[PDB]
Amino acid sequence: EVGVQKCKNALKLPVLEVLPGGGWDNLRNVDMGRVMELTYSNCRTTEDGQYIIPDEIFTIPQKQSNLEMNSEILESWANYQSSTSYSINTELSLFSKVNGKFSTEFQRMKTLQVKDQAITTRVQVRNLVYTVKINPTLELSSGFRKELLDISDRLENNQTRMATYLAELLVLNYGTHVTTSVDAGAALIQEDHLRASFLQDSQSSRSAVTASAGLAFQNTVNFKFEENYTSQNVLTKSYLSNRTNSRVQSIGGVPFYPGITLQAWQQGITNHLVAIDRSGLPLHFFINPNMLPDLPGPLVKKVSKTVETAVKRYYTFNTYPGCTDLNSPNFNFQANTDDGSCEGKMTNFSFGGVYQECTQLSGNRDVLLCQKLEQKNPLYSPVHLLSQIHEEGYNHLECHTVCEDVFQVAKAEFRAFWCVSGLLFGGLFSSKSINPMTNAQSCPAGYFPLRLFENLKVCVSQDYELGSRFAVPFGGFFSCTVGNPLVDPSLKKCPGGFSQHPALISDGCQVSYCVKSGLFTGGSLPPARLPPFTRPPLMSQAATNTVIVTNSENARSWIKDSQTHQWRLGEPIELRRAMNVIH
């Protein structure tokens, strides 16, 4: 009787199913959450008189219908068009070469080009109908507003590392962007994968290749699967023979089956409309004093700085520099960002060994952390590489039968070294990784592991006749703070010929290691690594109540009242009586 169903009973019209305002993940092109609030109170319609739209939504009739007769050749996977999220992946940002490179449509296309030495062609019937946009005066959703107040409460009780944790659960549930405009329509695409040596002789008749690819697309749709085709004349005999893959997907409308008139596909697009393009803005753009009137001024500029840090950390991880030229050697298959590390010679290095010590600062009673946090050399110059503090909580139970239990914490800082007539290297495996020497979390035969950063193992053998089959050279560790001195004989990268691999993200800082195997390189493409990148804190910090919030340079002060009402602006006679009881 309220909301949609009140409008839907009076009008008896469908609701438009393609709406802006939701969140958007831009590494993996998926949408998530609902940032903006959508209400159906005035019973608005599209001025066709055909759909029902919310109140803060205006549509623009496009009624456009493209129809292409030539496929387009896109040879490299580095410059990637998306066909559904092209306007939002190509924004001007620092990470424009990482957007969309963890999606379903991209990971298939990179696989089919590398494993077959192939080039791809697509041809398309696109058919845009509306453009749906949001008004500039707009209200946040009920569930998204409550999660921004919780980050503000943790920042005003001096609880960092809990506000940082709640900011990374905001990226996980609402993405990195907000879509401000969509495009309702229905596409129909065919992608083929031709052998790359079929293009190189037909450099003059490249226009004859793509003319037959768009010719075969309209035989596939118009003719039923039995061969009544009109394309097999001259070069639709090697086009069929140099191709390595073919698929046809429809995105809106009715489902596609071979042999359906393009007349009949285009008459089922009504009431089956999806978003075939979209654009938007980053997520921290919508955190400003205009959208949040209840909080003070400089407090929402501190929440918006926290969320901006969590989004940029999510792009800093899931970024793999390496070599990208396919015909060159040292080709890294997991790399999504070029480095210039191609055509670079190598030089062998000898590492003496790794060792690890612990400190055991506070928790001397009832918990002994400083036995597994220590690792000594099985057999140069060591480097420190990390200063990491490990905290653990335990439980007493004082009984008196009534009892009580108290929770302490136990700190133990550890230090992990490596030496710059030497131990061999057999790979690494962690609690989120495997060793690709064995395709399993095990060192090979003869090798023995030893812990280095409290979560991963270091496959090492001291021999020179039996473990020489799995021995791969080593290039050096570095971190987010200290680069290795092996490059520039500093910078944070591998030397030439080597490739880096992530290992052991530890509280907003990952360390890396350089190898030269060729076996760590290949395999399947890695998935995206989702936030939170930190385990939850133990609530060890005490809450410090803040009552008055001020800034010095325009003489504005916000006084929180009793009862936790709200933040009102401080009149200059009440803050005069509130600072004496404070100071």
Ligand X SMILES: *[C@@H]1O[C@H](CO)[C@@H](O[C@@H]2O[C@H](CO)[C@@H](O)[C@H](O)[C@H]2NC(C)=O)[C@H](O)[C@H]1NC(C)=O
Cα–Cα dist 118/246, whole Å: 12
Nearer to its own copies, 88 or 417 (CB): 88
* Residue 197 contacts which entry, ligand X, its own copies, none (Cβ below 5-8 A, type-dependent): ligand X
User: In angstroms, what is the minimal distance from the CB of 395 to ligand X?
Assistant: 10
Q: Which of 269, 460, 471, 514 binds its own copies (CB under 8 A)?
A: 269
Residues from 172 through 201 that contact ligand X (CB under 6 A): 195, 197-198, 201
Q: Does 544 bind ligand X (CB under 6 A)?
A: yes
Question: At 128, is the secondary structure helix, strand, or coil?
Answer: strand
Q: Which of 9, 241, 395, 552 binds ligand X (CB under 6 A)?
A: 241
Name the residue type at position 440: A
User: In angstroms, what is the minimal distance from the CB of 174 to its own copies?
Assistant: 8
Cα–Cα dist 477/475, whole Å: 7
Cα–Cα dist 141/170, whole Å: 14
Q: Which of 67, 66, 38, 65 is nearest to 53 (CA)?
A: 38
Q: Which of 6, 14, 372, 379 binds its own copies (CB under 8 A)?
A: 14
Question: Which two tokens mark 536?
Answer: 């939850």
User: In angstroms, what is the minimal distance from the CB of 414 to its own copies?
Assistant: 20
* Residue 238 contacts which entry, its own copies, ligand X, none (Cβ below 5-8 A, type-dependent): ligand X
Q: Does 242 bind ligand X (CB under 6 A)?
A: yes
Give the binding-site size for its own copies (rule: CB under 8 A): 165
Question: Which two tokens mark 208?
Answer: 């004859």
Which residues are CB-neighbours of 203 under 8 A, at least 6 positions away?
A: none
Question: Which two tokens mark 338?
Answer: 């070029």
Q: Which of 201, 293, 348, 404 binds its own copies (CB under 8 A)?
A: 404
Q: Which of 244, 489, 483, 164 is nearest to 349 (CA)?
A: 489
User: In angstroms, what is the minimal distance from the CB of 386 to its own copies?
Assistant: 21
Closest CB to ligand X: residue number? 241
Nearer to its own copies, 104 or 350 (CB): 104
* Residue 229 contacts which entry, its own copies, ligand X, none (Cβ below 5-8 A, type-dependent): none
* Residue 198 contacts which entry, ligand X, its own copies, none (Cβ below 5-8 A, type-dependent): ligand X
Does residue 100 contact residue 89 with C-beta atoms inside 8 Å?
A: yes
Does residue 514 contact residue 475 with C-beta atoms inside 8 Å?
A: yes
Q: Which of 377, 188, 364, 154 is nearest to 266 (CA)?
A: 188
Cα–Cα dist 414/391, whole Å: 11
Nearer to ligand X, 64 or 202 (CB): 202
Q: Which of 10, 92, 94, 399 binds ligand X (CB under 6 A)?
A: 399
Nearer to ligand X, 411 or 529 (CB): 411
Name the residue type at position 420: V
User: In angstroms, what is the minimal distance from the CB of 235 to its own copies?
Assistant: 13
Which residues are CB-neighbours of 260 under 8 A, at least 6 positions away?
A: 221
**Interior/surface letters 117-136, b for 16+ CB within 10 angstroms, e for the rest:** ebbbbbbbbbbbbbbbbbee
Q: Which of 378, 387, 536, 569 binds its own copies (CB under 8 A)?
A: 536
Q: Does 197 bind its own copies (CB under 8 A)?
A: no
Q: Which part of the chain contacts its own copies (CB under 8 A), choosing from 38-46, 349-357, 363-371, 377-385?
A: 38-46
Q: Which of 186, 250, 197, 251 is nearest to 220 (CA)?
A: 250
* Residues within the interface to ligand X (CB under 6 A): 158, 160, 195, 197-198, 201, 238, 241-242, 397, 399, 544
